[PDB]
Amino acid sequence: SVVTKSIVNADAEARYLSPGELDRIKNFVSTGERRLRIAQTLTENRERIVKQAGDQLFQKRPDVVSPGGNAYGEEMTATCLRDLDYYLRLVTYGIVAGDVTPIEEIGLVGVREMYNSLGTPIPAVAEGIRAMKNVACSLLSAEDAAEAGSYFDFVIGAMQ
Amino acid sequence: DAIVVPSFAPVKPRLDNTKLPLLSRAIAEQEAKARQADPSKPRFIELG
């Protein structure tokens, strides 16, 4: 969160929270309700967003869903979409927190280890998260879509 | 027999406001921002 990140950096200095840091907390706390609304819309349409992302990701990269790929068969395809759903849940968490530290902790640390062990192609996962970004942004208002794009962008940037 | 203070005459100000510096800045801003794109709205390319 904005609060914990500011507190941690202030802790490094051991100084009590600087006036600018406290003002940052004031800004974040004041805009929290709008953040809640963004997360609410994404979770309310969580099913539609995730399934559409699956359609678009498979269409960009048919090879992942082709025979001999990780997402072959209904069960394997469903697990791929479950991963997309997990990352959408993480994105809503990150929106509410106002920082990307929750997304990083839950899902992005060591993702390359996990996914190549599973055999899944990480760049294809990145394309899927990009599809999630586009779908969610289309649902969101222009002001809301700008911030949600940043939270999705950390995920795709880590994936690379 | 004359009245030194006949009555106090109203005056029409010479300097018209909404040309004064502060309102002029604000009038420019409201007009220009209205013509520009609108935050927090789904349809913005439709509007003329």
UniProtKB/Swiss-Prot annotation, chain A:
GO biological process terms held by the UniProt record: photosynthesis
**What kind of modification does the protein receive after translation?**
Contains one covalently linked phycocyanobilin chromophore.
Alphabetized InterPro entries for the sequence: Globin-like_sf, Phycobilisome_asu/bsu, Phycobilisome_asu/bsu_sf
Q: How does it sit in the membrane?
A: Peripheral membrane protein
Annotated positions binding (2R,3E)-phycocyanobilin:
C80
Q: Provide the Gene Ontology terms for cellular component.
A: phycobilisome; plasma membrane-derived thylakoid membrane
Q: What is its main location?
A: membrane
Pfam families attached here?
Answer: Phycobilisome
Alphabetically ordered keywords of this record: Antenna complex, Bile pigment, Chromophore, Electron transport, Membrane, Methylation, Photosynthesis, Phycobilisome, Thylakoid, Transport
Location within or outside the cell: Cellular thylakoid membrane
Q: Which of the residues bear the PTM N4-methylasparagine?
A: N70
- Relate the protein's function as given in its record: Light-harvesting photosynthetic bile pigment-protein from the phycobiliprotein complex. Allophycocyanin has a maximum absorption at approximately 650 nanometers.
Task: Cite the record's note on assembly.
Answer: Heterodimer of an alpha and a beta chain.
Q: Which family does it belong to?
A: Belongs to the phycobiliprotein family.
The name on file for this protein is Allophycocyanin alpha chain
